[PDB]
Each structure stands twice: as C-alpha cells, then as structure tokens.
Amino acid sequence: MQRIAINGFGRIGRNVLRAWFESPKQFHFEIVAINDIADVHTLVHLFKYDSTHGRFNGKVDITIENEKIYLNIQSNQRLLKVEVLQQKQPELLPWASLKIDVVLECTGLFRSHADATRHLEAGAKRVIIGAAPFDHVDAAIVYGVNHADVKATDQIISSVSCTTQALVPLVKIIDDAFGIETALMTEIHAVTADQSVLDHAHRDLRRARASGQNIIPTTSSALGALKRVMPKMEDRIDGYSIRVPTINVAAIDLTFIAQSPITVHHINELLIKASQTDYAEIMAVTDEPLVSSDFNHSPYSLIVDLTQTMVVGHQAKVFAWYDNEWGYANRLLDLCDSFKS
Amino acid sequence: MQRIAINGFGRIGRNVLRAWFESPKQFHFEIVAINDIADVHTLVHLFKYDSTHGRFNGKVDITIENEKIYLNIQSNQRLLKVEVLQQKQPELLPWASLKIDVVLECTGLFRSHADATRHLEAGAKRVIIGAAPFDHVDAAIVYGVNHADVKATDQIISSVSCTTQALVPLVKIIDDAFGIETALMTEIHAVTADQSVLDHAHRDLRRARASGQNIIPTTSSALGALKRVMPKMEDRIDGYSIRVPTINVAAIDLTFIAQSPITVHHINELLIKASQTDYAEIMAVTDEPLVSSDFNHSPYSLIVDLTQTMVVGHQAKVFAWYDNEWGYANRLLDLCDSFKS
Amino acid sequence: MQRIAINGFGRIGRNVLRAWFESPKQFHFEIVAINDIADVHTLVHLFKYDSTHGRFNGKVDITIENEKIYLNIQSNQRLLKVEVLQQKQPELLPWASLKIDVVLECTGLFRSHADATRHLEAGAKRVIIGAAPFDHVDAAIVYGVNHADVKATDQIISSVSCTTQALVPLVKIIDDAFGIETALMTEIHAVTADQSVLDHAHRDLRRARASGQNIIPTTSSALGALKRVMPKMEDRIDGYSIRVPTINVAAIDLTFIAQSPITVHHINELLIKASQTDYAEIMAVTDEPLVSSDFNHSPYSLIVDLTQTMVVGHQAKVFAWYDNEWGYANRLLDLCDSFKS
Amino acid sequence: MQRIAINGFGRIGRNVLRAWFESPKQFHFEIVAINDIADVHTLVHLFKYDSTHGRFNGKVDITIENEKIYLNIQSNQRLLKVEVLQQKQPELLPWASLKIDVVLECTGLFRSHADATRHLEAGAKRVIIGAAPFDHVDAAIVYGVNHADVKATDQIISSVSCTTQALVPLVKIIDDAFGIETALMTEIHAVTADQSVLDHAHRDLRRARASGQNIIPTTSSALGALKRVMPKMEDRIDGYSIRVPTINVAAIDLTFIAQSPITVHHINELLIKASQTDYAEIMAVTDEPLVSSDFNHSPYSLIVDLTQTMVVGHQAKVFAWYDNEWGYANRLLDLCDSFKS
Ligand SMILES: NC(=O)c1ccc[n+]([C@@H]2O[C@H](COP(=O)([O-])OP(=O)(O)OC[C@H]3O[C@@H](n4cnc5c(N)ncnc54)[C@H](O)[C@@H]3O)[C@@H](O)[C@H]2O)c1
Ligand SMILES: NC(=O)c1ccc[n+]([C@@H]2O[C@H](COP(=O)([O-])OP(=O)(O)OC[C@H]3O[C@@H](n4cnc5c(N)ncnc54)[C@H](O)[C@@H]3O)[C@@H](O)[C@H]2O)c1
Ligand SMILES: NC(=O)c1ccc[n+]([C@@H]2O[C@H](COP(=O)([O-])OP(=O)(O)OC[C@H]3O[C@@H](n4cnc5c(N)ncnc54)[C@H](O)[C@@H]3O)[C@@H](O)[C@H]2O)c1
Ligand SMILES: NC(=O)c1ccc[n+]([C@@H]2O[C@H](COP(=O)([O-])OP(=O)(O)OC[C@H]3O[C@@H](n4cnc5c(N)ncnc54)[C@H](O)[C@@H]3O)[C@@H](O)[C@H]2O)c1
Ligand SMILES: [Mg+2]
C-alpha cells in the first residue's frame, strides 16, 4: 500500500488531492505529505475555496504537533492524514522518514533529471515529474497508452502534459487504423497560472501580455513529449498552443494526412470504437453541441467532438476537449495506482 | 461624386462612417444617409462612444429640417450631413429621391438576392451586401484580389466576410506559388454581436452559450464565400470558427498540403514579397511576438505572423491576424472608391 | 399537495426546476408544466448544460403522449414529469385543464397586474410575478420577512427581485435595532441576460455597452420594490447597480446613518444574532476572506461579510453577497411551500 | 534642463514615458534614464506594444555606446536619448554621474524613507515615491491641491495613489462648500499587476484569487494617504476597494453626510464650477451616460459622473471615474513640471 507525496500544491497538486477523495473508485495508495513554499493556512484556504472547481465537499483540520504540521481531511467517507512541509529545496525534505514510495513533482521547477533526483536524495524511491521531460527520463508515460511499459526499476518518470495525454491517443488511434503521414496540432487553451494579469516583464514576450484581454499564440511542450512516447513519429508532428481568456478547459485541433482512404464516418466510427473498447478509461466521444464549460471537472483525457470532424482529400481534422486540470490530476492517480503489485 | 447609404448602423455600419473620417486619404464619395430601427439618439451615442475603438475624435449635431432628421458630423477637417431614417422595410426607403448610387447593406437580414433587391426597388442603383451570399449574387468581391472584375451590370455585390477577405489572399498567394492540394481553416475569433451574454434561447445551441465564459466552436460562412470567389477550390477547402472571450480581433490558422517543396523560410519570403508588391494595399507581415490587441484598429485585411509558420513534410500551417471590424470597414470604403475613376 | 407551473424557462425558470431537485429539503408541491417560446429541445439542452451552475446531475427523457410533450426528469432520488408548452400569450395557456395552483411568472414581460391576471383567466388560481411590481399587486413579498402576510384571497403576488431580498432584511434588521435615518445602496452585480456582448442599440444607453469590457452603472428596481414592502422608507433610501464582467453572484454595499450609538462590533453582533434566530432560513454571516465565486450556488438570500463592516461617526457601511440566480430560485420555492395547509 | 530618471519600468513607469511624448504641450525637462530588473529588449517590447493603451506612435532604436545601453525614441516631433540600467539595488545606481534631479520611484518596493533615501545616496537630488507613504515623507502631494506646499529642502516626496488623487479633490471641494461630517468611499477598480491569473498562493488571500473570474473586496491605501494630505479629516473618512475583471479604469463612489442643505442640482453645479475654475487642470464633469472604457486614456485625475449624484436627507453619493494609469502618470509629469523645468 504505497505512500505518495506531492511537491507543489498548486493547480495540479491541489486537484490531485481533491480527485483522490472524489474518485468513484477508491485508490489503493495513500497521499501522506504535501510541500509548498506557502504556509499551511494559505494552502488549506486555497484547497477549500476554488474559483474553478468550487468549494471542497469535506472537512479539513490542521494539527500542529511540537515538530510537525498535519492536515486531517475527510470527504466522501475517506480520510487522510497529510504531513505539510515548507521547504523550497527538495533535497532537504524528509522523504526517508516518511517512507515515500512516489513523489509527484507538480512545481514546474524540477523537470531536469538532476532536479528530480533531489527527491531521490531526500529519500523517495520514485519521482513522477508532472510535466514534459526537460532532458532525460527513464520513461515518458501516457496513462492508457504505454503505462504497462513502466519497469519496476524505473525511478524518474514523466507523466508528460495535459496536451500530450490527449494528443498521443489521437495520433496512436488514427495512425494504427489509417496511417499518419504528417500532422499539425492547434491547441486552444484556457489561461494558466504562469501568465500575466496586465502586461508585465516575463521570460516569454507573448505570455507577458494581459491574459484576460488577448488571444496569445505560444509554444507547446507536447510535441517534444510525443516524440518520447512514440519515437516512430519523429519529424512527423508539430503544433502550437493559443491561450485565450477562459479559466479552465482546452481543446486540441489535429490536422493530419491519411495514408489510406478516409471519410468523416470512418474516422468517427473508429474513435467511437476506441472509446468503447481499448481506451474507455481515458476517452469519450460526443455529438452534442457542447462548449468548454461543459467539460469543466470532466475526468477524461480527451472528449472527441464528432460533429467537428472534417475531411478534404487526404487531409482531415479532428477536435477533442479536455479539462487540463482535472483530467491530468486523475491520470496522475491512475498512474500511481498502476504501480500496485 | 457617388452617394452612399448605409442600411444597419451596427458594428460594421458605424465603423464604415468612422473610417471615412479617419482615413488618411479622403474618399471620392459621400455617405448621405443611414437607416436603422433604432432611434437617432441611441445611434449618435453609439457612434460617439465605442468600447473597442474609443471615442469618435469629432463632433456630431442632430438637426431637424423639413421634418427630416440629419446628423452633422465634423472630424479630421471633413464634414458630412447625413439623413437618418428609421424604416425596417428596405422597399420603403427613399433611395430614389436621395439619388443613392450604393447601399451598404449591413443588417445581416437581407443577404438573399431577392431581399437585397428591395433596395433596388426603392431606387438605389447598386447594393453591397456586407456579408457572405445566402443564395445568388452578381459578384462576390474581395478587395485587392478581384475588385477589378466588377462590371456595370453587377448590381448586387457581396463583399463577403472579415474571414473571407483574409483567407482568399492567403489561399491565392500560396496556391499560385506552391500549389495547394487541399487546406483546412481554423479561425479563432473575438465575440460577435449575435452571441449571448448568459446561456439563453438561440437558434444555434453553441452560440446560445455565455460568450465571456466559453470557448465556442461554430460554423464559418467563409468557405462557401471563398468558393464563390475561387470556384476551383470547391471540394479542396473546409474549416470552422471558434469564438473566445475577447472583444475584437481574429486570427486565421490555415493548414495546407503543398504540391511542391516547401520550407518555413520559403513560405515566409513568398508572403513578405506579396505584401510588398501586389497585395501592399491589404496585407502586412510581422516577425514580432505580438498578440491580438496589437492589431486592434489595424486597417489591413490580414497580417501574417511569420513566427507561427510551420512545415512538416508536404504539410504547412500559416497564421494571420486581422481586426475583423476595422479591416472589413476599410475594405468596404475601398470597394466603393474603386467604382469610379 | 399543490401544483405549480413555470412561465419562462430562462435563468430563473430553469434554476427553479433545478433547485427543486437539489434542495436538501423536499418540497410538498410539484412543478407540472413549463412554457417558453423556444422549442423543447433547446430548453432541455439549456436545462442540462449550464455555463454558470454546471451539468444538471440527472437525466431527462422527452416523450410524446397524446400530442402533448413531457419531460421525465430524475435527479437526487427525485422524479418529475412536466408538460412542455410553447404559447407566447398567457391567456391561451391550459391552466384550468392542468389545475394550476400557482404560476411562476418568469418571462419579465407580464409584470403589470393586467398581464398577470391573464394567467388567472387562463385558469390559474394564483400568480407569483418573479420581478418587481410594474403597477399594482395584491402583495409584495420577501420570503423570511413578510411572507406570513399573504392572505388566502391574494391572487397576484410579487416576489420582488434578488437585490430586494438581500436589501430588505438588512434595512429591517438595522432600522429595528439602531434606527436608519437614511441609507444609500451600491450593488456590484454580475452581468445579466438583457445586457450586450458588443456595443449594440438598447433601450438603456449604459446597458448598450459591451458587458465583458466595462464597468456599467445602471438603475436598480430594488428601491421601488423595497418601498412597496416598507413604505416608511420612501424618501429615505436610494441606490444603483454596477454591472461588472463576472457571470454570476452580486454584492450589496449599504451605507446608512444610524439614529443611535453604533460600533463595528455591535452591528456585526446584531447581524450574526439575526442570522442565528429569526432569519436563519435566508441569512448567513462570514468572516472568512472570500470572493464572489465562493458564493456561486449558495441558496442564501444574503451572506454578510463581517470584515467589510465600517463605522465613522454616525455613518456605517455593511456588505453582503448573494447568488442572484440561486438565492432567488430557492426563495421562489420557499414562497410556494409557505402556501400549504 | 531638469533631468528625471524612472525606477521601475512597469504600468506606471512606461506610461510616464509615453505621457511625456503624447502631452500636447512639451514638458521642459527630460527623462534621461530608466532602470528595471528586466532586460532592455523586454522593456522596449512592452513600451511599444500595450494591451490597454495601444501601440506607441513612435520609433525606438537600442544603441550601445561605451558599455552603456541607450534608447533613442522618436515620437510627436520629439526625441529622447535614454540610458537603460538593470540594477536591483538603488544605492548602486549612477545618479551622480547622470546628474539626476528627480527620481520617479515606480517599483512599489522602496516606499519607506530609508528605502527612498538610497536614491539620494546614489546622487539624486530628489525622489518622488509613486505610491502611498509607508512610514515618513517630507511631503505628501496631490497635484492640483497642494503641490505648492513643496519646499526647496523637501527631498522625499510622495505623489500618493491614483485613488488618493481622485478622492482628495472631491473631499476638499465638497467639504469647503457644504461641509462633510463623515464620508465612506467604495472604489471599483480594474485588475492590478499584483493580482493572480488563477487561484495561487499570495500574501493576501483575496488577491490570491483568479482576477478574471471574481469580484474581490480588498483594502485601499488612499484613506491613510488622504490623512497625510488633509489632517482635519482624521476620524471622518474610511473606505475600501473592489477589484473587478476589467483591464483599466476605476471609479470612486463617495457617500457623505453634509453639514448644510444639499440637493442633487446644487452638488452637481458646485462640482461643475470647481472643474471650470480652480480644478480645471485635473478635473472634468460629464452628464452623458458613459461607462469605464470611455475614460480609457483620459489624463484627468477625476471625471465626475453627474447623472449618478443622489441625495436622501443629509446624505449624498457622488461618483467619479479615472484612468488609474494615465491620470497618475500625467500627474507625475505635472508635479515634476511644478518644480520648474
Ligand atoms: N495547469 C495545467 O493545466 C497543467 C496541466 C498539465 C501539467 N501542468 C504542469 O504542472 C506544473 C505546475 O503547474 P500548476 O498549474 O499547478 O502551477 P501553479 O503555479 O498553480 O503551481 C506551482 C506551485 O508550486 C509552488 N512552489 C513554487 N516553488 C516551489 C518550490 N521550490 N518547492 C515547492 N513548491 C513550490 C507554488 O507556491 C505553487 O503552489 C507545471 O509543470 C505545469 O506545466 C499543468
Ligand atoms: N463584426 C464583424 O466582425 C463582421 C465582419 C464582417 C462581416 N460582418 C457582418 O456584418 C453584418 C452586421 O453585423 P454587425 O456586427 O454590424 O451586427 P450588429 O448587430 O451590431 O448590427 C446590426 C444592426 O442592424 C440594425 N437593424 C436590424 N434590423 C434592421 C432593419 N430591418 N433595418 C435597419 N436596421 C436594422 C440593428 O439595430 C443594428 O444596429 C452581419 O451580416 C455580419 O456577419 C461582421
Ligand atoms: N437573473 C437574475 O439575476 C434575476 C433575479 C431576480 C429577478 N430577475 C427577473 O426575472 C425576469 C426574467 O429574467 P431571466 O434572467 O430569467 O431572463 P432570461 O432572458 O434568461 O429569460 C427569459 C425567458 O423567457 C422566455 N420567453 C420570452 N417571451 C416569452 C413568452 N411570451 N412566453 C413565455 N416565455 C417567454 C425566453 O425565451 C427566455 O427563456 C426579469 O424580469 C428579471 O429582471 C432576474
Ligand atoms: N497601476 C496603477 O493603477 C497604479 C496607480 C497608482 C499607483 N500605483 C503604484 O505604482 C507602483 C508600481 O505599480 P505598477 O502597476 O507600475 O506595477 P508593475 O508590476 O507593472 O511595475 C513594477 C516594475 O518594477 C520593476 N522592478 C521590480 N523590482 C525592481 C527593482 N528592484 N529595481 C528596479 N525595478 C524593479 C518590475 O520589473 C516592473 O517592471 C506600486 O507601488 C503601485 O501601487 C499603481
Ligand atoms: Mg461577457
């Protein structure tokens, strides 16, 4: 019965903890610690009150022992006691004391294989970097696709990105059935926590601009990450992302060149079958006239909007929605649950 | 000189009149009447104050004369005296007595050949439908591409849409140089007037949804319209539009298969060259990391963002911005100006 | 028990029906009919999918029995079967046939005593106008304040407005304990369905302006409505509303002159004591550092934010939140429930 | 001429530089240096492209002479050569060499007398802190009210806040005419650069919350600041600020108890006369139904909205708009100009 810790109690970290309590299936592992540079009182406040996902439907108590700070959290007839830490430098964390089996690295600041190793030094056995790899990882994993390819010897793992976890299924499903010559991705994405309120100095001159006022083209880490999960598609895939002023939920627009005959009907039927069989854990398809809000708090890795499917000659476009926060958080727990032996 | 009337004093109609006063170049025609179902005081207020384009830099006085209502408008060293009408039925408009050469039909309600002809019945010599054709038109015109083909028998002209005026040049330039087998268009567009503030009954169930809260995929009239200007593109292009919570400015994302070798470098050089020569009146290209608000109040039909160009194999993506209100308005003025030398 | 109909399935009508299913209290009456000008498929879609309140957690099945349309709705262990009408004129509705005890009039168009009685002609026994009075009503009711005052002969009742149901308790509690010489109200309010997406002709020149871009001061009906509930406050109170770009939830800021000694502590203690006793059904008090989204889907008529209370000399300001949709809907259900024997 | 430096090239600093170029009448002093922690290319990009105020109508060329970085800026028939620094510690800046007469302190981080004096150590003869006094200042100045009270020996000056520069004139004008017993302010203010895009750890739990999604009550420095400027009003005035999802422009809502007879007419007439006589430089009054975006890029410290004025008994509300960025930036330049140039 494994022991998970979360480093970085932000949009992803907090949602991982909520999704644990809200899941209709109880997970076999326990989350037993969290860390963030903010104090516990700020953390509990933000865990309880969320502008995107609403009030946490449960009870949180804070316990100060002589040394340690704990949360006692109850919801949906489940209970966790969760040590809270406030240590900026992940090597100085007490992962050995706490017997931590997996650390979920959700800060965005420790994606290098070196930085992820800091958690290995502090005592943890295994790290899931919750982002695209910066350089080296023992594996890059998309739950529902290649999670069985985790070797019990692998110690630094990447759960890639929200975008990746939606792209890879699409690419795999379509490449297996029709063959993909090349494809280009357009992602339309809600604002993210690293953007700016008003125009302000920032590393990226596009993300420096007022996030509430602009359509903002930007890079996606998803293409680099898809190469690692499917090296057979090197040089065959590119794309980018566009930030717009919604609070949550994203869509992927994938345009590809088929290597065999295609119709709108054949593509949709294939995606329906995939969703009903081999991918039913992470994938759904709808034909209802829905918009982004309707997928807020959806646990799926992608939801294909089949009415958007288009074909001209050898070229086609498919479209899928996903909750970039709730889908990924759920896939993190699904991944941790897959290590059970 | 020519005598222009404007039917429907909305986003487009008001921006047409504003752009006449703001144009660096005076036009060789006059706007002599406007018609709306709204009261003159409402129209003058909205003409003077605009949430998108700022205050009209000028003065407006209402006078009554012979029981007719006029606006006297002074700005940028020009004055217009403009009759104001309030007739919901085009056939009952006094175009014959006003000696109207051109009606700009900007209501959205009279796009059919028969409906547009009502202005002809009322005595105007020529209508421009400020929208895509519904059924039939004498001619579908994109200024700077095929405005020279207008013949004196073309009485009902469609100036198509914002999107078509950006898409048609892109397709043409690229098809002429490299050849397009097929292409798919994704437009990312600011909210439009016909959308909803909150979820509300509406003919279209996606545009029924709260416009400030959602990413909303919907149809685009632009592909139908492009096919009327370039019939050879039938069955070779398709696309769709996405509404997002910004007030103004749109982007087109065009994905195509080239029929000859492409690189990013070569595509960009072609588009730059086009912008300097044959399409200098309507088209610019930038290489700066810009966002939508940077194009607000730009008069160009399109501004290629050369930093977004991508190529994999035979497949490319190009990206261009436009102010969907100010570009189109200026193109309506340009079209009228071309009607007599 | 008792049989209710809803005329107008908009933000209010739809949320009344949702709130029926969601209420922890089960109500001893049934909604047996809805009427809108829109078709049933649009209505069901909007009932199921909401940008503000999320997906309805339940199922709807549309059946045709006779030539009558019905919704079979199941949620929260509860079930209703509701006839669906599409009649634009209330006198033509089948209320006598259906044996309607109470019509909830939620269109906004039949607020006058004459228009409302059309339901009574059509066969309904009692109408509740879900809006401030236009001219005369038999009674103007704030649930939890003066609902005991409904006479069995009262046939045309007004449940006033969301703003009125926050304001009246506040004014009453404070005037009763300390005395209010005069007071002024500033409401800060989310956008409402009658506002504009872009600058558009509108009867109100302020509400003509782009609702996602602007702070928009406008009128509030709550002052007239309050004066019908409390005629003593004629000439002693005024105020206005400011619309800002949020989707739901509002706040009242009430500045009053006290007729007797006041402190922050004493005002807060009073409001707390009222919330715990005579007003526990409709009122809460918090001292947590919360924001508007934290009150979305709150059923309270008002939640006082005690940290905002200020006193200078004889002048004070109190501040209360409310979900302007969900509070009002629940108060409508509470009012209907109060009519039982 | 007099020689000014800007410390902190953000929303205020950048607008100060733009306002220099845009002012119809040329200022007779020059801005010769800017310092920020961000790289010069980021600074020049943000200076040229602004989501709120549009593109700079000018050209900027970056030059390296010696080991010094210079901005050569040309706009509106005016030229400046501006050294760019990147020194986080103000004691280390080369103000002695540059013979700086006045440093505009626009970072928000150096508001204490000791912090501001670091600029004096570096050789600057005078500092204007562009914010409320933190501990002590030689003078707290509202331009147009008490800028004449500056002494030649005053070295650390506060120009207070945008809010204070609107509040003080109102309080003063109304107090001088009718007498204010007490007053309470509500400010409705656009989002600021220190807020959050999504729910995020922050020192302040309300400003932690998604700024595009929420109404957020918070504190204002203006009340403390007004006390420094007008000591007689100790114990007579309080208030607070509310952040809402617009990008720029704020309003003051001021409720006061008057010590002599008042009417709406008399209050408005007073404010109009004040604006035409003693306050013409900094104040305007409108009687048209305007909204926030109509004041974007307005240089006034306050524009009174005479249609909002209300009176009940001895109590009154007045309402004023201001562009929080452009007003304050203009007032900084005017205060510098008041020292002679
Ligand atoms: N938000 C999404 O939609 C999404 C989806 C998939 C993956 N991701 C990835 O998740 C990661 C985090 O993103 P987020 O949206 O949760 O951002 P966030 O800013 O909400 O979370 C970052 C958190 O880390 C904390 N923190 C900062 N420095 C720290 C340190 N030294 N030690 C510990 N905690 C520290 C912050 O206080 C904060 O709570 C990134 O790699 C991001 O790319 C995000
Ligand atoms: N705004 C854009 O981005 C854009 C770009 C290109 C084309 N268009 C097209 O322009 C047309 C108008 O769109 P808009 O954005 O100006 O919309 P709008 O709703 O702002 O304009 C419609 C106007 O027509 C008036 N009107 C309605 N019925 C009338 C009647 N019977 N007679 C006279 N006036 C009447 C209304 O009062 C309103 O002023 C549409 O066909 C639209 O597709 C819009
Ligand atoms: N939403 C709020 O915050 C709030 C709170 C209190 C009171 N109110 C009041 O309630 C009323 C309705 O407001 P709303 O927000 O629900 O508006 P809405 O526009 O969302 O709903 C109006 C509904 O009435 C329907 N309708 C129109 N004409 C009809 C007819 N002849 N017969 C039947 N149905 C018809 C429309 O199709 C629509 O579904 C207004 O008077 C409003 O001021 C609103
Ligand atoms: N924006 C408004 O409406 C407004 C109005 C009145 C007063 N103010 C005040 O003006 C100040 C600045 O606010 P702003 O809106 O310009 O914010 P901002 O964040 O846009 O500007 C701050 C700037 O300072 C720079 N900076 C940070 N640390 C620095 C350092 N050590 N040395 C030099 N430069 C450094 C940052 O890179 C940034 O460019 C604050 O005190 C604010 O309250 C703001
Ligand atoms: Mg909106």
PDB file of C-alpha atoms and ligand atoms in Angstrom, chain B residues 197 211-212, chain C residues 191 196-197 211-212 245, ligand 5:
ATOM      1  CA  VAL B 197     -24.143  37.166 -22.553  1.00  0.00           C
ATOM      2  CA  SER B 211     -19.837  34.324 -24.576  1.00  0.00           C
ATOM      3  CA  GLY B 212     -17.483  35.575 -21.801  1.00  0.00           C
TER       4      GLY B 212
ATOM      5  CA  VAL C 191     -23.751  40.633 -15.973  1.00  0.00           C
ATOM      6  CA  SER C 196     -24.941  43.312 -24.599  1.00  0.00           C
ATOM      7  CA  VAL C 197     -21.970  41.372 -25.898  1.00  0.00           C
ATOM      8  CA  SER C 211     -20.720  43.795 -20.926  1.00  0.00           C
ATOM      9  CA  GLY C 212     -17.394  41.911 -20.803  1.00  0.00           C
ATOM     10  CA  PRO C 245     -17.683  41.215 -16.117  1.00  0.00           C
TER      11      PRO C 245
HETATM   12 MG    MG E   5     -19.475  38.936 -21.164  1.00  0.00          MG
END
